[PDB]
Amino acid sequence: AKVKQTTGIVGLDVVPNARAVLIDLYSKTLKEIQAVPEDEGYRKAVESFTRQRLNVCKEEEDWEMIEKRLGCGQVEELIEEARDELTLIGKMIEWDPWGVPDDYECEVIENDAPIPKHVPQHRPGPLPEQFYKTLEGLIA
């Protein structure tokens, strides 16, 4: 219920009324990627996470609850992510990389050579449920 007044990251200033700028950017992204064919997985994933993020921003107003429900980053980081996603959507539209060439071949290797426990392994924490739910929606 108070202004953030500090992000903790230099060069990334706080954005007052971040809900207003984040509630219409998502709508712009949703209305912009209608041109992408539905059969492509990029559109499904982007719609699946954009709708959930837009909803969560809809029910709750103050940024603290918004970022706690999402559980990922801060509101300004979310705004930057949304802008980058919109730019990527535009670039995808203009590039038009959709489609599979004839006689397509993809070489897939799933070798599993164990490595010691003491070598640097990037171990992250468990994700929020939406990251998994997007993958479940994509696969099925």
């Binding site: 599979v100 060439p101 070489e107 897939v108 290797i109 799933e110 070798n111 599993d112 050579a113």
Partner: peptide, 10 residues
């Protein structure tokens, strides 16, 4: 150890 590989078609 197995180091398997499967090619994917269209």
């Amino acid at each position: 150890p197995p180091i398997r590989r499967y090619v994917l078609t269209k």
